[PDB]
Structure formats: C-alpha cells, structure tokens
Curated annotation (Swiss-Prot):
Name of the protein in question: Allergen Fel d 4
Primary location group: secreted
Alphabetic keyword roster: Allergen, Behavior, Disulfide bond, Glycoprotein, Secreted, Signal, Transport
Family according to the record: Belongs to the calycin superfamily. Lipocalin family.
Natural source organism: Felis catus
Gene Ontology cellular-component terms listed: extracellular space
Tissues showing expression: Abundant in urine (at protein level).
Length: 158
C-alpha cells in the first residue's frame, strides 16, 4: 500500500511495464512523428550501476524494438545517450502498481523536459491520472497526452 521516494530497490522495479501517460514543455516532441514517443516493455538491473530498458517505436509507420543501457550517478539519477544526451530520475513508485519519471534532453538547441507514467496494467483509474496531471501543473508542464487512446505497438510485445 506503500509509496517509495528515497532508497529505490532496483531489483523491485524490474519486470514488465506499460506506457500510460506522456507530458512535455514542447508539444512537437510528443507528436505522432516525434522520436520521444516510445512505449516501454521491460526493465532489468545489469549490476548496482546499470539499468537495461526495452521499448517499441514507430519508424515510417512500422513498429521497431530498441535496447538501451542507462548509467547511475547518485541515488535515483541516471544518464543515457539517445537522440542527444539525457538525464532522468525516478520521482516516486509503488513497486507493484506504477512509476513516475522526470527526464531532461540536451541536443544542441535549448534543453526540454519529458514526464512519463508507467504501470503494471495497460490502463489505470481516473484518481491516478489526476495525480499525474497535478504533478505536471506544479512544475509548469501543460502538454499532456493519454497513450491509452493511441497505438502503442501492443501486438509486438512478449
């Protein structure tokens, strides 16, 4: 019944997840053609200082599978290379229900932010959606997308 914000057990966030919500401070990046519209499948620890991710994305309308490794720095803060340099942190999680991620992308333009909600089931309550939208508004993010109303490459999983 229990919300963790501090000393995240990365053996306990591992396994199967789904992408539920997406928000940015730049609307074009979270669009049908944007390269940051990705759908998570699987998370695993490789050691105390590496997380594995598996995603799907659409490239010229065709579903494609990607594998990345992210490197740890302090507790709960990670770096990864993909369409530029990225830094992100796990804000809060319930190990058997949901995860909230806050991410920053560099490129060579000005930086932008992404916030992501993942869940163990492919949809969630209105109560949890309202919680996400509140966190985004408290940090000045206004562009918010429900991915349960859109193709998320579900037929490609397993």
């Amino acid at each position: 019944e229990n919300v963790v914000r501090s000393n995240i057990d990365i053996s306990k966030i591992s396994g199967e997840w789904y992408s539920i919500l997406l928000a940015s401070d730049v609307k074009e990046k979270i669009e049908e053609n944007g390269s940051m519209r990705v759908f998570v499948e699987h998370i695993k620890a490789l050691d105390n200082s590496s997380l594995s991710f598996v995603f799907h994305t659409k490239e010229n309308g065709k579903c494609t599978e990607i594998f990345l490794v992210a490197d740890k720095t302090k507790d709960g803060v990670y770096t990864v290379v993909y369409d530029g340099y990225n830094v992100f942190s796990i804000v809060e999680t319930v190990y058997d229900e949901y995860i909230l991620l806050h991410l920053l992308n560099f490129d060579k333009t000005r930086p932008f932010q992404l916030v992501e909600f993942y869940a163990r089931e492919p949809d969630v309550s209105q109560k949890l959606k309202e919680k996400f939208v509140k966190y985004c508004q408290e940090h000045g993010i206004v562009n918010i997308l429900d991915l349960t109303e859109v193709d998320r490459c579900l037929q490609a999983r397993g």
